[PDB]
């Protein structure tokens, strides 16, 4: 029992079960399928969901808060969306619910990132159509020749107490607009690393203070990882982020792994047995046993669609 290979899916976890949905391969994976990976046993279970099932999408943004799945955005066969769904997995047959949220939602987009803080889901960045909204938008000129698309640096809050969208008034210098960056939350710090913007897959590291809404840039002393998009960034402790895979400005698929030590502001390269298994647009989830479970994604330049090496392998890192 194993799910088909795919890139651009979502994977969220409670530390024990990892829920996999969506993505595409070589096209979109079946919308009603929810794959559950037991991190302790290593076994899969497919279930068919009901209710307001989202369309099959890549680049959607999902979270698991107290075993409630939330999903925003993505790209389906007719383009980007800004719909918001929730799937309670706490129990019966799982039923999707499309949440008609109050307030101004974000623009339709995919390949963004989210931080979870108290009752708030905080979404940053992504790629989609021209957006009233705070922040900046920057067109992708390769989309001009349909609807043009571009990157944003937008921060949006969905307050789960009321399912109301809003935007915080931030201080500091936001990261540039970007997509396929990776976000990770530790405490009240929402970290974002890398991502694609114009002609670069970037190497910069920021966090947004989720209490005071101040942006900070982190300059680590010493060797930093090469700039990338489509990588994963995973909290593995109150003081370490785990970086794996991605895709460089020069289209190199990556298999390096690093841990960022927050308190020392330092990157440490991480040796592992998958140096011959680069992955981009995979997912990664931390286990309660201190592991990082990488699933899916593409082993080569997925931009050459007819040659794309999509994967269904589980990679287990012991951090």
């Amino acid at each position: 029992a194993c799910p088909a290979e795919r890139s651009g899916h979502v994977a969220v976890s409670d530390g024990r079960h990892m829920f996999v949905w969506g993505g595409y391969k070589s096209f979109y994976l079946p919308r009603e399928e929810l794959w559950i990976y037991n991190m302790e046993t290593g076994r899969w279970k497919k279930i068919n969901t009901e209710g307001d099932v989202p369309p099959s999408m890549s680049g959607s943004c999902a979270v698991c808060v107290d075993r409630v799945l939330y999903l925003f955005g993505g790209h389906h066969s007719r383009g980007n969306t800004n719909k918001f769904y929730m799937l309670d997995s706490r129990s019966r047959v799982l039923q999707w619910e499309r949440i008609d949220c109050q307030g101004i939602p974000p623009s339709s987009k995919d390949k963004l990132g989210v931080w979870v803080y108290k009752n708030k889901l905080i979404f940053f960045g992504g790629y989609g159509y021209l957006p009233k909204v705070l922040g900046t938008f920057e067109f992708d000129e390769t989309s001009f020749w349909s609807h043009p698309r571009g990157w944003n640096d937008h921060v949006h809050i969905l307050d789960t107490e009321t399912f109301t969208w809003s935007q915080p008034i931030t201080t500091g210098k936001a990261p540039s607009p970007r997509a396929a960056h990776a976000c990770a939350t530790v405490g009240n710090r929402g970290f974002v690393f890398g991502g694609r913007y114009r002609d670069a897959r970037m190497n910069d590291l920021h966090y947004l203070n989720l209490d005071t809404w101040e942006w900070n840039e982190l300059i680590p002393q010493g060797i930093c990882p090469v700039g990338r998009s489509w990588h994963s960034l995973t909290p593995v402790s109150s003081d370490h982020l785990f970086l794996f895979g991605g895709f460089t400005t020069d289209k190199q698929p990556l298999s390096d792994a690093w841990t960022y030590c927050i308190s020392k502001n330092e990157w440490i390269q991480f040796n592992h047995p998958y140096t011959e298994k680069p992955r981009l647009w995979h997912t990664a989830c931390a286990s309660d046993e201190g592991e990082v479970i990488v699933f899916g994604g593409c082993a080569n330049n997925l931009l050459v669609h007819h040659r794309a090496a999509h994967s269904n392998e589980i990679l287990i890192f012991s951090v």
Binding site: G8, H75, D110, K111, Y127, S143, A179, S229, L302
Partner: peptide
């Protein structure tokens, strides 16, 4: 399609 902008 899905991969643009990354």
């Amino acid at each position: 399609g899905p991969s643009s902008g990354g």
